[model samples]
Target: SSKPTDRGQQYKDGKFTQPFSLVNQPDAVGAPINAGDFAEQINHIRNSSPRLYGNQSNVYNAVQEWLRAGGDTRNMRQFGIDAWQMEGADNYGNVQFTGYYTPVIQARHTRQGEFQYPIYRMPPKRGRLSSRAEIYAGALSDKYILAYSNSLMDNFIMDVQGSGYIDFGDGSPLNFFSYAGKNGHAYRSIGKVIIDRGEVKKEDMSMQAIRHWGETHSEAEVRELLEQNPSFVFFKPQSFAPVKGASAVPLVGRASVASDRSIIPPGTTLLAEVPLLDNNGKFNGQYELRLMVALDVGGAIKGQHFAIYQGIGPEAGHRAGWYNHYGRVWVLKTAP
Candidate 1:
C-alpha cells in the first residue's frame, strides 16, 4: 500500500497543540463567540444527511453541543475536538482569502428596450451545449429565456457570480437565478485580457473598474472583449431568497466560505484571520478573526484557496470584489 501524497490528512496526529491565541494563533480560541453568527451553518448541518459529514455523528453532536453552550471554546476540548494549526504555503502557514456575494440587478420578464440580453435555462435533451460566442450567435435563441438583463455585461457578471436576484424594477415578486449548468469550456479571465492590453493596471482591476470600462466602450468593443472568455454558465429561476451554496444551504453573510472539496471537507468549521481593507481598498494594517463554514465549492477554488461569501448588494460587492489577501485557516476536528 502507498500513502497519499497530499497534506489533507497530515493534521490527523494533532502535532501542533499550541494554545489557541487570539493574537498569534490561527485557531484564535479567544475570538468573539456568537452562537447566532453560525446559525445558518448550524441549521445546515442539522438538516443535512449524515453521509454528508462522513457518518461522523460525533462531530455533528459536538457542534450542536458547542452551539448549545453559546460557542464556548473551553467546552470544545471536552467534546472531543482538539485545536490544531493549519500548515500551508509558508512555514508559518499562510493561505489566500477572497470574497464573493450575490448581486441584485434590474431585469425584465421579456427582452425589451435596454433589457435585450437573455439568460437561458439548460436546454432539454441537448448534447454538449454551444460555446459562449456560439450561444451569443443565436444557438440558444429558441430556448426558454429564464430572464433578461439590462446589459450583456450585467448578465455576464451574474453568470460569473453563480447566483443573484433579478429586480423587475417594480414592487412585484422578486425573481431569482441560481447556478444550473455550464457550457463545458474552461474559464478565461477577461480581467487578464484588460491587464495584458494595458487598459487597467492589475491593482485597480476591480469589478467596478471592469464595469466602468464596459460603460465607456462601444457595444461591439464590449462584445469582442467578453468573447475572449470561452466559459458560459446557465441558470434556473429560483425562489426569491438568499443565494444557496453547493451544499444547498442558505449562505451566512461573512460566515460562509467556499473551499476545494478535496482539501477542506464540506460542512466543516474553519477559523480565518484575514486582513481588513480601508475605504480606499488598501490593507489598513488590521485583521479580523472570523469563524466560517465550508458550505460551498467552486471550479476556480483549489488547494489552500478559499472564497468568503460577503452577502448581498453593492456594499458587499465592493468588499468582496476588492478583497484578495493572504490569511491562515484551521479545521477543527475531534481528538483521538
Candidate 2:
C-alpha cells in the first residue's frame, strides 16, 4: 500500500504568509497600482473561447473584481486568492524559462525578383502535406501562395515562432499570419544541426547568428542546411488582428506566456521571477517579477517550461533570442 505524497507549500487566505522579494521591483511597488494593465488582461480572458477556461469563470470573475477595485501587490492575499509554491516531482524542482516574440519581416504579395521564397496556405482536403525539403524543392508550387519573402531565414523564423507580421514593401498595411496547420512532422532544430556539423560554435547558435551565416553562405549550402529539418508549417493571413494564442485571444507583450496546457492551463494568471540582464547582455544580479497570462501553447513547451512573449520587431527578436534562463512561478487563484 502507498500513500500520496504532498506536492508543495500551499497558503490560503493569508494563513501562511511567505515574504518573497520581487525582482526588478518597479517604482510603483508601494504606490497604488494601475488597474488598467491587469484589467486589459482580464478582458482578454473574458473574450476568449470559454472552453479554454473550463469551469473557472468564478475564479476569473473574482480576480477581475479584485483588479477593478484597484488591486495592488501589497494586498494580494486580502483579495481571497491563494498562493502556492510550485514544486516539480522531478528535475530537482527547477523551472526553465524561454522567450518568444512577434517577428516582423519584409514580404511581397506576389513573387518577384528577390522575393521568391513562398509561404503557403493549407490546401483544402489535402492529406499528408509536403515535407520541408519537398516544399523547398517546389512541391507547393501548384498550391495557393499566401506571400513571399526575400530571406528564407525570415520565413523560417516566422514558422518557428508560430506567428508574425509581414510588411509588404508597398504602402499596404502590415498583414499578420497565424498558425493554421503543420505538415505532421516533428520540429527539428536547425540550430542543433548547425552545431552538430561544426559550422558554428554552440555559444554562437543564436537566431541572429544563424541568419548571418545563411546570408554569408551560398544559397545551395544554406538550403542544404535548412533541409536537415523536415518540419513545415502553414499559415493564414490575419488581416490586422493581433496575433492570437491557443485561447484565441490577442496576446499581450511582456504579460503573455506559452506554457504546457496540461500543467498551466490557458487563461491562468501566474507570477514569474526571472533573471534580468542589462543592455550590454550582462547579468546584473537582479530579477523581475512579471505578471503573465497563460494564453498560448507550443509543441516544445513541456513540463515546468515557459516561453515569455517579448513584443514585435527586430529589437524584440534580439531580446527573445538571448532570453534563456531559470525562473520561479506561482499561480494566484481564488481561495476555495
Candidate 3:
C-alpha cells in the first residue's frame, strides 16, 4: 500500500518512528492529553461556577486549553471546514467548504453584563492576572448558558455612523465621505496621505484640504484625487514623518491563523497570498490574492488570520457586499 509522499522520520528505540508531515511536527514528549482529563477540568470549573457557565463545555474547554498552552486558534483558519453544502447545493468533488473562522478567545468589556460592577471595579489591565480573573468572573456566567452569545458579539463592535473622510496632501482641496459600518475601522485606514514624500506630517497638509475637497468635489472625484497621489501615508497627530505607506493594496478576511497584534498588527502590513473564494456558486475555482490590512476588530476576531468585515456603502454595496471568503495568507516578516 502507498502512503503520503510528504513525510519525515524521527528516531526512537534505535529505529525510525512513524513519519510526520512536513507541515506538522510530531508531538513533543507528551501531548494531546487524554480527552478524559480535559473533561474533568470542565466539570471542575463548571461545578465551581455553575451559575456563570453553561452549554458548549467541550468547545469552551478546547478553546481555553488551546490558549493556556500558549497557542492561539485565531490563526488556525483551517479548522472550520464544513464538509457538506446545504439545500441542494452542488458539491465540489475534491474541494472543501471553509466555514466561519473564529478565535479561541472572545473578548468582551465588563460593562456589558450582569457582573458589570465587579468587572468595572477591577477593569481588565493586560499583563495582570487580575485582568484574566475579571474576564472570567464577569464575562463567564450562567454556568448552563454558553457565555458566547450572538447578542454579546453585537456588543463587541463599536459602530461608526455618518461618513469618514480623509484629506491627502495639503489639507484643503479635496475630501470624500465614506461610510464605515460596524468594525469597519479594523480594515480601513482613515488618515493623511503625503504626495512625493515618505514622511507624513500634519503640517504637510491641513484639515482645510479635506473640507475644501468635501465642499467642492463629488465623492467620486475625491476618491479619484486620492488614487492619483503616489504615496499613501498615515500620520500621527502633529508629526511630519510618514508613519507607514506602501504600494500594497489593503485587504481584510477571516484570520486563517492566530496573529499577534504587536508583531503583525492590522494596518501595519499588507498580507498578501491569503486566498479567498466565494461560498456561493457565483465564483468557483477562481482565486484572488486576499490582502488584509488589519484596522479594527470584532468580538470573534481574536486570533491570527481572523478578520472583521467592513460593509460596503449603499453606492458600492452591489460591488462589495458582506460575504465570507477563504484564502491562504502568510504575513511577511518584512514589507517589500
Candidate 4:
C-alpha cells in the first residue's frame, strides 16, 4: 500500500490525514457542481412537503434566493451566504463527515425455509425490551414480525442502516422498513469490537468489511459479534416509500443528509464540499460544493459529525462504506 502507515483512507479513531497541502482558501471557487445536478438536488428540497415552510424551512428560503439568482454560486455570495467553516482555524473541514445509504434486502412474509431471522418492532415498552443477544435468542418471538430474510446478517444490516427496503419475493414493489424505535440501550459499534479483537484490521473496517467478515466466518461467530453490542433496533413497515429521516419526510439521496441537529438542524440548508469517488468507491481527493439539506438526525452522528446520504443499493453502499473522510461544509443562512 502507498500509505504504509495509513492502511486506509481516513482514520476512524481520528488521526492526522496525509495533509491536504492546500492552505485555507475560502474563496477557492469550488467548480464542477454541474448546474444540472445541483438543480436535481435542490429540486428535491423544493418538492418536500409540509409546504417547505411555516415560519420553518431554513432550506426553502435559501432555495427561493437560489431560484431567483439563476441557480449558481453567486446565490451564495449575492445572498450573503458564503462558506463558513465551524470551529477555529482548520478551514480544510474541521468537522467529521461519514455517509449512509438505504439498504435493500430480499425477504419473505413468513419465516419459512432459509428465511428464518425475524424482523421485529419496538415492543410496547412493557418494562423493557431484550438486548441484541437476547432478541436474537428469540426474546421478541411473540412480538410482531415485520418480515423475514434468508441471511441472518441481512436482518442486522437494516438495523445498522436505521432504514431499509425489503423485497418480499413477489412482483410487487420493495417494502420500506422505517425505524420505529430502539431497544432503549446504549448504542455500540460492533465494528470497533471486531477491530479490537484483531478479527478485522482498523484499516479494513467498514460496514461492508464487517459484512464480508460475517459472510466468511462461522454463523456462530457472527452472532457472537452481533451480541457484543447490547443495543438492538426495531423497525416497522412503512410500506413502499423512499426512506424517511427523523424529519418524517422522504430523504432524497445525496440531496438529504443527517447532521448533529443541534449544530445543523433539520430543514437547514447547507453547502458542502462533498467528496468525489470513483466507480470503485475510492476518493482520490476531489470534491464539489453543492446545495444540500440537513433533514435528518443520525443516532451516532453527533457533535461536529456530518453524514451524507448516498442513495440505495450496492453502488451507494460502496460509497457509504468508503466514507469516514472529511471535507468542508457551510450552513447557508441569510445575513439580513
Candidate 5:
C-alpha cells in the first residue's frame, strides 16, 4: 500500500545541500551568539526522552559533539558544522518570522468577586465536547472550573499561547497552567473576523491589537469577538514545569522558533539572521546571526513562516508582537 504524503520531506535530501557560510554569504549576518540559550537547548535535547527525528537527531548530537570539541558559539568566523541553505523561501534566503511568548495571568483558587472567568479542566470523556460558545454560556457549569481568572481576555490569551504561569495575587504559590486538551473544535482566525467586521485595520492587526481592542471596547463586544472562534483550549495546573516545545524539550530562549515542522522539522538546528528592530518596532536594515532551534509548532505558522519564542510577560509580548518581518535562515545539519 502507498504511504501518506510527506511533502515537507521532499525538500530535504539533494535540494537543501548547498553549503552556506555566514560572513561570505550574499546576505549580511551579525549577532552575538546566544550562548546562554544554546547551552539550555543542548542540555535538554540529550536529557529529554523526546528524540529528534532520525538524521536531525544525528546532526544535533554531532553539533553538540563539535561544541564539545572546542566549537565556540561566539566568535565563529568559520562555524565548525555545515549549514544547508533551506529551499522553500519565496526569494532566496528570505523567510517570514513571527514571535510567541508565554503569558502570566492573574487568577484565584476560588470563584469570587472580580475573578469570574474560569479556566476549565478537560472533560474526561471523548464524546461531543462543548463548543467554546456553549462553554461560555455555562454548558458545563462550575464543576469543571480549574481556577477563576480576573480578566476574560487574559484567560483567552493564555489559551491562545497554550500554556502560561498563573498568579493568584495572594501568598499562594504561582501555578503553571500547562495545556491539557481542546474542546474538539479547531481554531478559527479572530483576526480575520475583526478585519471583516471593520474593527481593526488589517495592517494594524496583531496579538497586541487584539489585547488593545479588549481594553478599548466594552466587555460584551470583546466577548462577542472571542466567541466568533469556536475552539477552546484547556489547561492543568502545575506547581512548576519547564515550558516545553512541540518536540517536548524545555524551551529556554529567544533563539527558539515555533516552526511549521513540515518545512523545518522539530529539533533541527537553524542559523537565523535575526533582524534588529528599534524600540518603536522598525527593522533598520541590520541583521544578527543567532543559532536557533526548531522546537515548537503552530496552526497559524505555515509554509515559510516561523514564530520565534520570545520569553515571558508583557515585555516579551511587545517584542513578539513587533516581529512580523522577514529574515534569512539556514538549517544546520550533519555533513556528508
Candidate 6:
C-alpha cells in the first residue's frame, strides 16, 4: 500500500530508502534486480575500457568511498574484487582506490584497485577487467545505479541461511561450565540450568549441545542430530586456516546484522526472526534472521543480503572464523 507511515518509518528505524521515483518517486518501486544484472554491468564497463562511462564512474565513486572507510572484505570476495578507498581532506572527501588508474597523476584525479579479470582469485595483470561495475538505480543505493562486482553481489542474494543463539560464556549463571562434569545434570535438575540456558536462548546458539556432543560421539550421531534439531553452538577459532587454534573458546555477544553505515537505516525496518536454517549447506547451529534497509551504502554490504557483526577480540574472531552465514533476507521498498 502507498502509506506515508510505512515509508517514513524506515528513516526512524535507520537505513536509507532507494529511489521511489526517478523524479520524486512513490512507495512501491520496480521488481528487485538480480546479481546477473550487476555482472553484466561490469562486463559492459571493462569492455568499454580506456573510456569509462558516466554511470560506471558514479558507481565507482560510491563503492570507492565505502571500501576506503574500512568496508568488509567478505563482500569483495563475491565479485572477485578487493577494494579500499583513501579519503582526502573533509572527513568525507573524494575517495581513491589502491592499485588502479595512474598514481602518477594528481592523487585526486584517479583511483587504483585490482579487477577480478576473467575469474576471481588468480593473479593480477596489467589492464585486466575494468575495476568498476554499472549501478542500476533501485538496488540499494541511489536509484540503484552503482558499480561493484562480487563483493556487493554476494551479500545481495538470498542464499546461505542461518539460525542460532547468543551465549555469554561463563558470564551466565546457567553456564554448564560452572559445574564440574555430570553435576551439570544436577544443576539441570534444579531451576538454575533452566534459567541460565533460557537466558541466552537464541537461535544463533541452537547447535551448541550437539557440537559439544560431537566432540565425543561418532560422526553419524552428530549428523543425525544436526538433521533433526536446529540449535546453537560456540565457534572454535582453529577452524579458519589463516588463524587456527588462536583462541580456546568463543566469546559472548548477540548474533545480529551489522552494516558498514549504521546499525539501523532510514526507510528500512528489520525484523529478527528466530530458529532459521542454512538452506545452502551444512552449518553448526541455528541462524538469526536480520531484516535491514540500506539508507547509505558501505564498501562492504553495498547490496542486499544480511551481514552479521561479530564483536571485537579473540573470542569474536574465533566465532567469526568458525562459520560463514550465507543468510537470506526479504526486502520491502516503499515510495512516498
lDDT of 2 at 240: 77
What's the TM-score of every candidate structure?
Answer: 0.61, 0.59, 0.24, 0.58, 0.61, 0.20
Candidate 6 overall Cα lDDT vs. reference? 0.25
User: For model 5, how does the per-residue alpha-carbon lDDT over 136-240 read when each residue is reduced to its tens digit?
Assistant: 888776777887887777777778878878777775665787889888788899889989989889998887778778878777887898898889998787668
User: On residues 1-336, what C-alpha lDDT tens digit does candidate 4 reach at each position?
Assistant: 222212122222233243222223243363425445445545555566555544344545555556556655544555555445543123224456688987778778877887777788767785246787887877775547777777777777778888878778687877787888888678788888988899888888877787778779776777877888888788887856766777766676677789877766677766666667677666676666666677788668886677888887666788788776666656656555
Q: Output the lDDT of residue 292, model 6.
A: 24
The C-alpha stretches of model 2 lying farther than 4 A from their native spots are 1-35, 68-70, 88-94, 107-148, 155-164, 168-173, 177-217, 223-238
lDDT (Cα, tens digit) per residue for candidate 6, span 195-235:
35463343433323323334465544433333221211111
Evaluated with TM-score, which candidate comes out highest?
A: 5
Model 6, TM vs. native: 0.20
Worst 10 contiguous positions by lDDT, candidate 1: 4-13
lDDT of 2: 0.68
Query: lDDT of all predictions, in order shown?
Result: 0.70, 0.68, 0.28, 0.66, 0.70, 0.25
What is the C-alpha lDDT profile of model 2 across 27-117, one tens digit per residue?
Answer: 2233223245555666676677656555666666666665666555555666675545444323233357778887688778777887888
Give every collision pair in model 5: 30-288
Give the per-residue lDDT of model 3 (tens digit) for 1-336.
Answer: 232111111122122222211112111222222333333434433554353234333334444454356433232223321111111101111111222221111222233442222111211223123222233344424322222211211111111122222222233422332222221012232224333233235554443334334336454444443333222111111222111112121222222222335434433322222223343324343443322333343333333334433222222222233333332323322111
Q: Residue 162 lDDT in model 1?
A: 87
lDDT (Cα, 0-100) at 332 in candidate 1:
67
lDDT, model 6, position 201: 40
| TM-score of model number 1 | 0.61
Model 4, residue 50: displacement in angstroms? Answer: 3.1
